[PDB]
Coordinates of all heavy atoms in Angstrom, one line a residue:
Chain B
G159 N 55.1 -182.9 -15.8 CA 56.1 -181.9 -15.9 C 57.5 -182.5 -15.7 O 58.4 -181.8 -15.2
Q160 N 57.7 -183.7 -16.1 CA 59.1 -184.3 -16.1 C 59.9 -183.7 -17.2 O 59.4 -183.2 -18.2 CB 59.0 -185.8 -16.2 CG 58.5 -186.4 -17.5 CD 58.5 -187.9 -17.6 OE1 58.9 -188.5 -16.6 NE2 58.1 -188.4 -18.7
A161 N 61.2 -183.8 -17.0 CA 62.2 -183.2 -18.0 C 62.3 -184.0 -19.2 O 62.2 -183.5 -20.3 CB 63.5 -182.9 -17.3
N162 N 62.6 -185.3 -19.1 CA 62.8 -186.2 -20.2 C 61.5 -186.5 -20.9 O 60.4 -186.6 -20.3 CB 63.5 -187.5 -19.8 CG 62.7 -188.2 -18.7 OD1 61.8 -189.0 -19.0 ND2 63.0 -187.9 -17.5
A163 N 61.6 -186.5 -22.3 CA 60.4 -186.7 -23.1 C 60.1 -188.2 -23.3 O 60.8 -189.0 -22.9 CB 60.5 -186.0 -24.4

Side-chain angles (χ1 to χ4, degrees):
Chain B
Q160 65 177 3
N162 56 89

